[PDB]
Every structure is written in structure tokens, then in C-alpha cells.
Design a protein around this nucleic acid. Structure first.
Ligand SMILES: [Mg+2]
Ligand SMILES: [Mg+2]
Ligand SMILES: [Mg+2]
Ligand SMILES: [Mg+2]
Ligand SMILES: [Mg+2]
Ligand SMILES: [Mg+2]
Lengths: 52, 52, 147, 187, 134, 129, 52, 122
RNA sequence: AGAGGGCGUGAAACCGUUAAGAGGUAAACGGGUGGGGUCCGCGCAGUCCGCCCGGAGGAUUCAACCCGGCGGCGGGUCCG
RNA sequence: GGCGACGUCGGCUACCCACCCGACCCGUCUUGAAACACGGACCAAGGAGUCUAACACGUGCGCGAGUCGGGGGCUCGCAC
């Protein structure tokens, strides 16, 4: 009645189900991937507050 | 009384919203965070047999 | 949505967004297209040039069906049939050219627009342009006419 | 007072999309990590293109892409477009190129996948090339709309070529004086 | 839930049909339940109250096991008067305070030829409700 | 002080004087609620001296000291037990209020749940017998 | 695509031997901005014109 | 999908209190009652929660099973712990960090457990 | 009856009264302190609270270690 | 480091009063209003940029060389 993504809906004449804008949607796994973190700089983790 | 009371939505958006309305009723977090106390229930797309 | 609009944000200010001096009254310039030659002239040239006068022949009771001909030019010419035809068309079977009649697709005239591919055709239309027939006669195709 | 002049304080670009798409908002969060952290300028171009409007994201047809990838050097790169890939009827056969885009249309991704190519989203682009190495990022004709041929000097100035707003094309609709030297003048 | 599209569900039109009621509808709407002894002997739930029923009051200021007959049924004020529950005025004359018949339980019906025919018809129409369970 | 709330600073406030509407003294049709004067000639908008001040963002209070009560907490008004328990990990920073509709029976119970959890209630002895 | 199996529960609460595959509706894009856009617009087709 | 379930519930949900100030999340399974992305007990594969014991003697520790989501009758496995006020505070921190089961929110599991045990002391 | 026959609630303008304060530059207001007053909070030279350690006696039982035992975490031939 | 109990300590608002300094009455048209320019004795409730059509441009969403059922039609006789 809504069809999978291989085959269209049968009881609805010209409808197939809407595609995704993101495939992998858990980006806590993407940003911890070795492909990503091979490429990053380093965190810059001082504060450098105002100096009198 | 000739105010435009009634609104059109083109039907691929009606079917877009009805696939997004069914797919969130399978995630236990979204259906419990709408308030439905679904703690003790088993498997989230509940299917009882056709004898019901 | 009366919430999201300008008059809520403009409520409390005296002149309501229309000026202390000009003080929007009813119809300061005339109603409608008034002054189209006289005091709105600078607007009617520079934005509507040509707007005043006779230009042509009067034609009483034209009927918008006698002059009816939709056009398909040669780039869109192959989508009238299957893509299953032209891949079947070129598989070494002789020069057997498929038919494409635009009149059962709802078109009458075949115009020119470049890159007609290398296969021979026969094209059934009510009308043709001469650029279009010499694209078709250049790929070895034919150009058969129908009433 | 100082006299350092006004209007230099404010810039009028976009810092987040105005969309409420929760799938575009996670693509934003992925790339504004990568923009401020990996030091490659591909990820700054793609990040500010995700912020852009729908008019600033024009559709890119199937034969602008494969005409812009018959060039020498582009033989094994991937095509990025932030926006849709429609398909041309004009093109007859499709090469096996690798594309990457928001929202490829249905008939286009039947022709890319028959050709043997691979379609990607911006997730699995980021896993593939985080620096954006070996990508050809394309755009559609953003001044190809029907609106931009109405803009210019004026339709009634000398050599305007501006296409005025008439309600219906035909005889006696904005064609009489100012448009021919017999009736009045010609601009 | 109401399905019949010819009968009301608004507040304002059901009140207006209540206080402007005809006096033969008004005896129907002033009905009272039978006692638990007596609804088993007649297998009928409730009855429209008349002039010499023995009756006791089940809620209110005057309540609790005080069988005593009605004496006057105001339909216009939706009120029965019972011979025992009264009220002394400031004058010292005693008057009947009036109570609504929904708050009141018949303990002995007054049978006549018609109160046989009303009970028998209200009781016969319950066995067909039992005969539907097949 | 029944309870002590972590670090309480010196609460400075820039003004303690409750901005009033112009001409609110002279009439009683005019409430004292602030409405900024948009007349073309008046001397409050044009900001002469010795007259009624008009609020601007410079009078804003310090961000680390904003919404601080004089006791050092910040109020969070509740209605029952089930939303008193949400303030359990905030009890040295925030304080509870009982809303003005909560009956004297239930108000008696949600202050005894407050004393077990050691959360400051600002109005513990309200609507007693 | 990941389409798991879902047990059909009997009338007495426990499972049965029937296990239906999750149809592809439940892996659609979740879009609460379209569902807001549709439910705003289709609840307005529901109303009598004003007592003008 | 810990993030897209977050971007529905972020605002615009039940279990969400906003009064005059701070926002609260009042979840069944949430240590520190903030509506944080970490501190949400519906949206994660792994969650930690410490409710008081039913009688008023101890702490229960609900954790998420991970053996199957989408099936919430058996999604939670809970342990009542009734020990002597630092070995129940040490027992629930071995349950966090001897496992790799969210080293995040380790102190928030023991700030909550310590402040819920002295809710029981008289 | 603080619901007493145009009687639910009973605002303001206005007026009576009592209380307090004051009064030849008409009153009113801004800013700054002061004096009185109503009232609150603390409770009144009686205020700190929880952390660890060493002191002083008391009162109980686990921990460490092992065994029984169910339940979860993570890795593995992807073995079924 | 020092100081203080049953009347004292602290506190502030739409409390009242005092004093020094500053201070003409609002709205409005206007080059210019405190104006010997007009409106306003006072209070309460009411009270003024709406809705429909057309168009332009920006923006958001669906599909995308296409798009669109609005007009009808079908679905057991269904509160919504
Ligand atoms: Mg203005
Ligand atoms: Mg304006
Ligand atoms: Mg004007
Ligand atoms: Mg009605
Ligand atoms: Mg001026
Ligand atoms: Mg003036």
C-alpha cells in the first residue's frame, strides 16, 4: 500500500516511498570514525582569558 | 462568509507526512515521549492476529 | 496568521507606519490606472512601453483550434517511444527504422533542435520545418507526412 | 563619538539555514564540525551552500554534470552538488560517473544506477573524503530562472531587453507606442 | 455515543426542552427507582412517581429509612411532597419542603388497573433483551 | 536561613525603583505600567534633565546574578509531588514555590516531600489551619 | 536496508509462531516539520463557516 | 539514531517543563533532570538510571539491556542495591566504568545516588 | 443576609468617616539621602554546613578470599 | 581581629513626611508649541490597517521537464 524502495506501491498507482537525505544518521559514530579523525587538526583547548 | 476556510495540500505531501507519521510510531522513544505509557507492552509495532 | 504580520508589531505607534506628513488618506493619485497619460506618464513608459494604441488587424471571432499545432523538436523526439526501441533499433538487423508518429502523442509539427542521434527513423507528422527534415535526412532517416 | 562610520558593524549572510528539516540540520552539524576543524576549504564551500536558499540552490541537470565531467582531469573524481540532480531527456547514454548530492530525483537515479555509477549522500561523502580530496563540486545555473530575465535597466529604456510584465502575450498588449517608430517613438 | 442525526447533543436545546416540557412528558421525566426488594419482585428498574406511593429519601438533608407517603406531586416545580419531611417556618406554620424524585426510592407501589399494565409492559420488554443473547 | 545555597554573591541591581509611565501621577486612568512616550514634543522621549527616566538595556542586571532572590536561590513554582522531584539535583541552586491554587491538604504533603529532599520552599507555612 | 522481524502476539498476550517482516514504511524519513505543515492545513478543512 | 530522535524531542514534546527560567525534562530514566542530549533516558542505546527503592530502603539501578530495543517490556534490567552508604556508592560506579557502559554520567549517577540515600536517613 | 424582594460577584471616578502624617511660593514629579510608620525575616553578644583523617567509649555485620546462584557488559570461529 | 538578648537587629516596596538640586502640559499639525494654536472636567467598558480577488518578489516544503484534482467519481447505512 506504500511499497518498499525496490518496488512501488501496488494499491497506489504512481507512488514510491520517499528517499533519504541522510543514510547513516547517528553522527556520534561518524565523527569518531578513523577516516574522519585521521584528518582533523587537534582540539585547541586553552582559554586565553583577558590579561591585565 | 467567503473567507478561505479550506486548504489544499498536494497529495505527495499528504503521503509524505503519513509515512513519517507511521515510522515514528515504531520508535519507542517518540511514542513514549508523546505520553503513551508503553512501558510494559511488548514489541512496538504491536500485531495481534486477525482473529481480533 | 494574524500573529506573524506587521500590524501587531506596529500597534502603539501613532501614524501606524504611514507618516506624520503624508498621512495616508484614501486615493491621492486617483483610482486604478488613472493618469496613464497625464501624471503617471513616467511610470507608463519605462515600465509598460507600448501600452497605448492600435497596432494590428482586427480579427472577429477567432477560434483557438484552427491555428492549433504543438511542436516537438528533435532533441525531445526520441522520448515519445520507449527507450527499449532504440537500443533494439541499432542491434545489427539491417536498416530497419522504427516509426515515431507525433500525432498520437499529441503533437503536429516537428521542429529543429540539434543532435538527433545516429539511427535511421521514419517520422510521421502533419508538418515539418526544413531544418528538421535535413537533420532526419542526414542520419539516413525518412520523413513521411500525414493528414 | 568616534566617527568610525556606521554599517560596517553588520554582515548580512546566513549562519544557519532557515529550514526546519531535521535531516538538513544534521548535515549542518556534521559539516560545521568539519569546517572549523579539518582545515580544508572544500568543507567551507559545502557548509555555506547548505545554508543557502532554494533559489540559491538551483537544480543541476544530468547533462550539465556529465558535460562538465568530460573535461581532461575529471576522469575519476566525484561530482558534488548541494541540491538536486534532475535528468535530461536530451542525453541518450550516460557514463558511469560517481555523484554526490542532496535529493537526486527518481528518473535520474535510475539512469545513474543503470550506467554503473554510484550515488552518495553527504554522509558517506564525509566518510569517504573528509578533506574533500578528489571532488568536482558543481552548481546549477543560478541565474537561469524566469525571474532574472525581468531584471535589468527598464523595459522602456534604450536597449533594455528586460521583458516587461504583460498579463498575456499577443497583439495589442504593450506593443503600440514606444515599440515602433510609426506609433509615437521607439525607445 | 449518539449516532442518530435527528436528536440533539447541544446544551442549550436540551435544557430548553426540559424546562418547557409538556405535563405528560413531565411525569415521565420525574421518575424514581424502586426499592431493591421490590425491583426483584417486578424485575423492573424505575417507575414514574404518583400520589400515594410509600417512599423514603436516599440523599439530602432529610434522609435515612423514613418510609412515608407522598402527598402532592408538583410537576411544574419538579417536586414531590412527602407527608413526614417538613419544615417549620418563622411564623411557626409547618410547610412541606420539596425534593426531587431522582433522590428518592419507592418502597411500596400504589397498584391500580393502569399500574398493572405499565409494569407488565416495562417488564415484558426486558425478556426480549434477554432473548437476543443467542 | 533554613538552607544555604552555594556561592551567593553581592547582588547589585543598577536601580531599585520600578519605572513608571509618564503622566501616571496626574491621572488615574493611566496605569503605572511603562509605555514609552512617542509624542513629537514631549520632554521624556527627548530626554531632558530632571525628569522621568526611560528604560534601556544599560539597566540590565549581571548575568551571573540575574533572577537571584535575596536569599540566593532562584524560584521554580511547582504544583504537586511529581514535579517537586525534578528539582532534586538543583536543590543548592534553585528553590521551589507552591502555586497559589494548591489546596491546603496537598500543600501540606508537598512540603513534607520537600523536607526529605532538602529543597528550599519559599512559602512553607502558607494556608495552614 | 535493515528490516527486522516482528512477532505476532496472540489474543492472550503471548507470542505466536507468526513473525511478520517490518514493511518499509517504518524506515521512512521522520519529518515533524511536514507533519506539522500537513496537520495545520488539514485540520482547517474541518470547520463550519463563521457566525458572520 | 540517537540524534534524530533527539531532534524531534528537543523541544516540542512531553516530559518537558519550561517555567520562567530553566527547562526540565522529568523523564522516567534520567539522572540529572536537564533535557540534555546526554541526560535523556529514552533516546539512547545505553542509559543509566537510579530511582529510590520501592520500600524506602536502598537504590534501584535501571540500565538498558542492549540485547534488543523496540521491545520495552524487557528493555530494562534493574538491580536493587541496599548497602551501607559508601559500598552502594562504590558498587554502582563499578557498574559504570568497569564496564564500558557510558563512562559519561558517572558522577551524575553517584551524585544522584548519594543525595537519594540521605533522603532516607531519618 | 458580609445573599433581605433589580437581592450572584460589587471595580473605578465621587463622597462620609476614623487612623497616621503634614501645610504662606497652586499641586504633582525626577534624582539623592534622612526621619517616622506598616510589615516581614531572622532571634535575639546562641549560630555555619556537609568531606576525609587521627582521638574517646558504645553498637552490629559485611567486605577481602572462595563456592552456590541467577542477570547483564565487551571481545571471537560467524559455529548453529 | 573586635563589637550587641525580649526591645532590639536588618529590609524594602504605589506608605507618609522633610530637605538640597533639577524640573512649564499632554496629544497634535508645524521651519518652530509651555504657548495669547487647537482637542481634553473625571472614571469604567467599547473603539480604528481587516477579509476576498489579481499580481510582483523574498522565503519554507513536495515532486522535478514536468507539475496540479481544485471539477466530477468511487468506497456498508455510520458520532467525530
Ligand atoms: Mg517610529
Ligand atoms: Mg509603512
Ligand atoms: Mg503617501
Ligand atoms: Mg446551536
Ligand atoms: Mg520638535
Ligand atoms: Mg505640544
Amino acid at each position: 500500500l506504500y511499497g518498499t524502495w525496490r518496488k512501488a506501491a501496488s494499491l497506489k498507482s504512481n507512488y514510491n516511498l520517499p528517499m533519504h537525505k541522510m543514510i547513516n544518521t547517528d553522527l556520534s559514530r561518524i565523527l569518531k570514525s578513523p577516516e574522519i579523525q585521521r584528518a582533523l587538526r587537534a582540539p585547541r583547548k586553552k582559554i586565553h582569558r583577558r590579561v591585565l | 462568509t467567503w473567507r478561505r476556510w479550506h486548504r489544499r495540500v498536494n497529495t505527495t505531501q499528504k503521503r509524505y507526512a503519513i509515512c513519517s507519521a507511521l515510522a515514528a510510531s515504531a520508535l519507542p522513544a517518540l511514542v513514549m515521549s508523546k505520553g503513551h505509557r508503553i512501558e510494559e507492552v511488548p514489541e512496538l509495532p504491536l500485531v495481534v492476529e486477525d482473529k481480533v | 496568521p494574524s500573529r506573524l504580520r506587521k500590524t501587531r508589531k506596529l500597534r502603539g505607534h501613532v501614524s501606524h507606519g504611514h507618516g506624520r506628513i503624508g498621512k495616508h488618506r484614501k486615493h491621492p493619485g486617483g483610482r486604478g490606472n488613472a493618469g496613464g497619460l497625464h501624471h503617471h506618464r513616467i511610470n507608463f513608459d519605462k515600465y509598460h512601453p507600448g501600452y497605448f494604441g492600435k497596432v494590428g488587424m482586427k480579427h472577429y471571432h477567432l477560434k483557438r483550434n484552427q491555428s492549433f499545432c504543438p511542436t516537438v523538436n528533435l532533441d525531445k523526439l526520441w522520448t515519445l517511444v520507449s527507450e527499449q526501441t532504440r537500443v533494439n533499433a541499432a542491434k545489427n538487423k539491417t536498416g530497419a527504422a522504427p516509426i515515431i508518429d507525433v500525432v498520437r502523442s499529441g503533437y503536429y509539427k516537428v521542429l529543429g533542435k540539434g543532435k538527433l542521434p545516429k539511427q535511421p527513423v521514419i517520422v510521421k507528422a502533419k508538418f515539418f520545418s526544413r531544418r528538421a527534415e535535413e537533420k532526419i535526412k542526414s542520419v539516413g532517416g525518412a520523413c513521411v507526412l500525414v493528414a | 563619538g568616534v566617527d568610525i562610520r556606521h554599517n560596517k558593524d553588520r554582515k548580512v549572510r546566513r549562519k544557519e539555514p532557515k529550514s526546519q528539516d531535521i535531516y538538513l540540520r544534521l548535515l549542518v552539524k556534521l559539516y560545521r564540525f568539519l569546517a572549523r576543524r579539518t582545515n580544508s576549504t572544500f568543507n567551507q564551500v559545502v557548509l555555506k551552500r547548505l545554508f543557502m536558499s532554494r533559489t540559491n540552490r538551483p537544480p543541476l541537470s544530468l547533462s550539465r554534470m556529465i558535460r562538465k565531467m568530460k573535461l581532461p582531469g575529471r576522469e575519476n573524481k566525484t561530482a558534488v552538488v548541494v541540491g538536486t540532480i534532475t535528468d535530461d531527456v536530451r542525453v541518450q547514454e550516460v557514463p558511469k560517473l560517481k555523484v554526490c548530492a542532496l535529493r537526486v530525483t527518481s528518473r535520474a537515479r535510475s539512469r545513474i544506477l543503470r550506467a554503473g555509477g554510484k550515488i552518495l549522500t553527504f554522509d558517506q561523502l564525509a566518510l569517504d573524503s573528509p578533506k574533500g580530496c578528489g571532488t568536482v563540486l558543481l552548481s546549477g545555473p543560478r541565474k537561469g530562472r524566469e525571474v532574472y530575465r525581468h531584471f535589468g535597466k527598464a523595459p522602456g529604456t534604450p536597449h533594455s531587453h528586460t521583458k516587461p510584465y504583460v498579463r498575456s502575450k499577443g497583439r495589442k498588449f504593450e506593443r503600440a507606442r514606444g515599440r515602433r517608430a510609426s506609433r509615437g517613438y521607439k525607445n | 455515543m449518539k449516532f442518530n442525526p435527528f436528536v440533539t447533543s447541544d446544551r442549550s436545546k436540551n435544557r430548553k426542552r426540559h424546562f418547557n416540557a409538556p405535563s405528560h412528558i413531565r411525569r415521565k421525566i420525574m421518575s424514581s427507582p424502586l426499592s431493591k426488594e421490590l425491583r426483584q419482585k417486578y424485575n423492573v428498574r424505575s417507575m414514574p412517581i404518583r400520589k400515594d406511593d410509600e417512599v423514603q429519601v436516599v440523599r439530602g438533608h432529610y434522609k435515612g429509612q423514613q418510609i412515608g407517603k407522598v402527598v402532592q406531586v408538583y410537576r411544574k416545580k419538579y417536586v414531590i411532597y412527602i407527608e413526614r419531611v417538613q419544615r417549620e417556618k418563622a411564623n411557626g406554620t409547618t410547610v412541606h419542603v420539596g425534593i426531587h424524585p431522582s433522590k428518592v426510592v419507592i418502597t411500596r407501589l400504589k397498584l391500580d388497573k393502569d399500574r398493572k399494565k405499565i409494569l407488565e409492559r416495562k417488564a415484558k420488554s426486558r425478556q426480549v433483551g434477554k432473548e437476543k443473547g443467542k | 536561613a533554613a538552607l544555604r545555597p552555594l556561592v551567593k554573591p553581592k547582588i547589585v541591581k543598577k536601580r531599585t525603583k520600578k519605572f513608571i509611565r509618564h503622566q501616571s501621577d496626574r491621572y488615574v486612568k493611566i496605569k503605572r505600567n511603562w509605555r514609552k512616550p512617542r509624542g513629537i514634543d514631549n520632554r521624556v522621549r527627548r530626554r531632558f534633565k530632571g525628569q522621568i527616566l526611560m528604560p534601556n538595556i544599560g539597566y540590565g542586571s549581571n548575568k551571573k546574578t540575574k533572577h537571584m532572590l535575596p536569599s540566593g536561590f532562584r524560584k521554580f513554582l511547582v504544583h504537586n509531588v511529581k514535579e517537586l522531584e525534578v528539582l532534586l539535583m538543583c536543590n543548592k541552586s534553585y528553590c521551589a514555590e507552591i502555586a497559589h491554587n494548591v489546596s491546603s491538604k496537598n500543600r501540606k504533603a508537598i512540603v513534607e516531600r520537600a523536607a526529605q529532599l532538602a529543597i528550599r520552599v519559599t512559602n512553607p507555612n502558607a494556608r495552614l489551619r | 536496508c535493515a528490516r527486522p522481524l516482528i512477532s505476532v502476539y496472540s489474543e492472550k498476550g503471548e507470542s505466536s509462531g507468526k513473525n511478520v517482516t517490518l514493511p518499509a514504511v517504518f524506515k521512512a524519513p521522520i519529518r515533524p516539520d511536514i507533519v506539522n505543515f500537513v496537520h495545520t492545513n488539514l485540520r482547517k478543512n474541518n470547520r463550519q463557516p463563521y457566525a458572520v | 539514531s540517537a540524534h534524530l530522535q533527539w531532534m524531534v524531542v528537543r523541544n516540542c514534546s512531553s516530559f518537558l517543563i519550561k517555567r520562567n527560567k530553566q527547562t526540565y525534562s522529568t523523564e522516567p530514566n534520567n539522572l540529572k533532570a536537564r533535557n540534555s542530549f546526554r541526560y535523556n533516558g529514552l533516546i539512547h542505546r545505553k542509559t543509566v538510571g537510579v530511582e529510590p527503592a520501592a520500600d524506602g530502603k536502598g537504590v534501584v539501578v535501571v540500565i538498558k539491556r542492549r540485547s534488543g530495543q523496540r521491545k520495552p517490556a524487557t528493555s530494562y534490567v534493574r538491580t536493587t542495591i541496599n548497602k551501607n552508604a559508601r559500598a552502594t556508592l562504590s558498587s554502582i560506579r563499578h557498574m559504570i566504568r568497569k564496564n564500558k557502559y557510558r563512562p559519561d554520567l558517572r558522577m551524575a549517577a553517584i551524585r544522584r545516588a548519594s543525595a537519594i540515600l540521605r533522603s532516607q536517613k531519618p
